[PDB]
Amino acid sequence: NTIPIGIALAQTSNVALLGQEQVAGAKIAEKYFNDKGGVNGTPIKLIFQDTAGDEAGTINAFQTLINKDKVVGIVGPTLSQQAFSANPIAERAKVPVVGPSNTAKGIPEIGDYVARVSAPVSVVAPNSVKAALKQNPNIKKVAVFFAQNDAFSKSETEIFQQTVKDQGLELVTVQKFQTTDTDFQSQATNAINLKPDLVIISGLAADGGNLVRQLRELGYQGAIIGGDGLNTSNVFAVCKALCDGVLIAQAYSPEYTGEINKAFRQAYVDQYKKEPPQFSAQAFAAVQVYVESLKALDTKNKVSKIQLPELRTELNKQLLTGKYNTPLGEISFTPIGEVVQKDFYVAQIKMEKDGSQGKFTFLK
Ligand SMILES: [Mg+2]
Numbered sequence: 001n002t003i004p005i006g007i008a009l010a011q012t013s014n015v016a017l018l019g020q021e022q023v024a025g026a027k028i029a030e031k032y033f034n035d036k037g038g039v040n041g042t043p044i045k046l047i048f049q050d051t052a053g054d055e056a057g058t059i060n061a062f063q064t065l066i067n068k069d070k071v072v073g074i075v076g077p078t079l080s081q082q083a084f085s086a087n088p089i090a091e092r093a094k095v096p097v098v099g100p101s102n103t104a105k106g107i108p109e110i111g112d113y114v115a116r117v118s119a120p121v122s123v124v125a126p127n128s129v130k131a132a133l134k135q136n137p138n139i140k141k142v143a144v145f146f147a148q149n150d151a152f153s154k155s156e157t158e159i160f161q162q163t164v165k166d167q168g169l170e171l172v173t174v175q176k177f178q179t180t181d182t183d184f185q186s187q188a189t190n191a192i193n194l195k196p197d198l199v200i201i202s203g204l205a206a207d208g209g210n211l212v213r214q215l216r217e218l219g220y221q222g223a224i225i226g227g228d229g230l231n232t233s234n235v236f237a238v239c240k241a242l243c244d245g246v247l248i249a250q251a252y253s254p255e256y257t258g259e260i261n262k263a264f265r266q267a268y269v270d271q272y273k274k275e276p277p278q279f280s281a282q283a284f285a286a287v288q289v290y291v292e293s294l295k296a297l298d299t300k301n302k303v304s305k306i307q308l309p310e311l312r313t314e315l316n317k318q319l320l321t322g323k324y325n326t327p328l329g330e331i332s333f334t335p336i337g338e339v340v341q342k343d344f345y346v347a348q349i350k351m352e353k354d355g356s357q358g359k360f361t362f363l364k
Contacts, residue, residue, distance in 0.1 A: 002045040003038070003303065005290050006065035008076030008086075009100075009283075013053030014179075017205035017234040018279055019078045022100055023048070025280030026075065028267050029287035039294040039303070046287070051077050055085035062089050070308060072294070072315055073098065075286040079204075080104035080152035087114050094309065096316035100286040101279055103228055104155035108337035113316050115337030117285045117328065119251045121156040121228070124344055126163040128225045128249040131346040131363055132198055133167060135247075136223055139198045141172045143191035145184075145211060147203040147229075148176040156202040156227045164200070172196055177211070179204050184211045188218050197222045204229040209238030216242035223247070231278055233358070241355030250345040252281040252328050253362055260288075261327040274359065276327070285326040293319035 007026050010019030026046060034043045047069045049061040058077045065071045066089075073096040077083055080102040090097045091111035099107055099116035103124065107116050133139055142164045146157035157174070164171050172194040175187035188211065191199065199215060199222060201208050208230035215224065216239070226235075226248045236243055254265050254275040264284055268276035297303060297318045303311055323332045332340045351358035 001304070002043045003294060004045050004047050004069055004071045005287070006069060006071035006074040006076070007046050007048045008051050008058065008061040008065060008074050009048070010053055010078040011048065011050040014206045015053040015078055015204065018101065018229070018232055021232060021277050021279035022078060022283040024268075024272065025276070025283030026287055028264060028280070029284040029291075032263065032267065032284075033287065033291045039291060040298050042304070044291060044294075047071060051082060055082055058082040058086040059089055062086050066090065066093055066095050071095070072308070072311055073290055075100055075283065075290070077102070079150070080107060080155065081150050083107055084110070084151055087111070090114070094316075095312050096319060098286045098289055098319070100283045102152070104152040108334070112336075115320060115333055117289060117326070117331060117339050118282050119339055119341045119344070121152070121159045124249045124251050125156055125159045125227060127344055128247045128346050129160065129163045129167060129200070131247050132223045132225055136197065139169065139223065141170050141194065141196045142198045142200060143173050143175065143194060143196035144171065145175045145177060145187060145191070145199065145201045145203070147179045147207060149178045149180075150204065150229075153179070153202040153204070153227070153229060160200045160202065160225075160227070169198075177203065177207065179207045181207060182210050184214050185218070188215050188220070192218055192220050198225065199223070200225045200227070201230065202227040205232050205234050206238060209235035209243070212246060213239040213242045233274070233277065233360070236349070236351065236358045241351050241353060243349045243358060244351040246349045248347055248349070248360070250278050250347050250362070251341065252278040253343070253345050255362065256327070256329060256343070258325055258327065258329060260325055264327045281327040285324070285328050285331065288326050289319055289322065289324055290315075292324055293322050296322065
């Protein structure tokens with residue numbers, strides 16, 4: 001006997017450029033927690049249902065997890081775009097969802113069954129603008145790009161634009177693109193002609209990486225910030241040496257000294273031969289929330305005896321009250337499922353000259 005927890009992430013499509021990191025973190029969590037006896041001796045079982053890259057696929061994954069796989073709760077989906085459409089399905093069904101990477105404004109407000117461990121754009125994004133200004137205090141002109149078809153990108157760009165204004169900078173253009181675009185020559189040239197000192201990009205990974213490369217090809221020599229959708233080493237293949245110097249805010253640090261982060265980090269580095277990425281740490285934290293909540297519930301009300309609909313509702317109620325020492329730091333939730341998290345960082349892509357290898361360097 002095991003306790004089924006659903007994992008609904010983008011395992012296919014270009015959205016898997018983010019999702020694959022999340023799968024890695026979730027698998028590390030499953031082993032970590034099961035090696036500690038699961039839920040008071042009862043192992044968990046992660047049941048993966050691929051969402052692919054769109055809303056329909058996410059709805060299907062959620063419905064399969066809820067109805068066929070009988071899961072006690074869901075971790076997912078990868079994108080805020082998907083969450084706004086699919087999470088209401090789980091809300092209506094009274095099945096908890098813990099978002100591992102959904103940072104758009106309004107996610108926890110979807111309902112009483114929706115929480116997230118991923119700190120939102122309003123608290124993560126501004127630090128990268130501040131970091132750019134530290135590296136070049138003479139930045140004056142800023143060009144902004146965003147993916148107009150993606151809910152998170154639209155939410156993030158609003159924060160970046162407000163931050164630019166509040167820092168007393170000139171917003172010289174806001175250019176739109178689609179996450180499915182590969183060619184940005186007209187928007188990039190439009191922006192370059194305005195002589196920006198800083199360019200900010202809110203998109204996902206393939207698109208964001210292609211845009212970074214093209215800006216550099218077209219002769220842009222100023223600073224670049226990428227938003228959360230570019231926050232993966234999977235961009236390195238796309239922009240190669242031309243990824244160098246991109247600043248990306250972080251809601252996780254490998255060097256955070258919390259005991260469980262040390263364990264998570266060691267497990268990650270031993271397997272993948274590099275530092276754990278944010279999305280992996282966040283996925284681990286989401287699984288952790290479920291395991292620790294299940295343990296607390298089971299101690300008070302043995303879960304093997306609770307029928308599934310009540311188990312789901314009691315698990316949701318429990319998880320919202322918990323305090324968790326996770327790889328992200330000490331976190332908890334507000335009464336509507338927003339994450340409470342203190343520490344944020346900025347990292348910078350450092351590519352080797354040949355362009356075949358790179359890393360994220362954390363700024364002090
Ligand atoms: Mg909520």
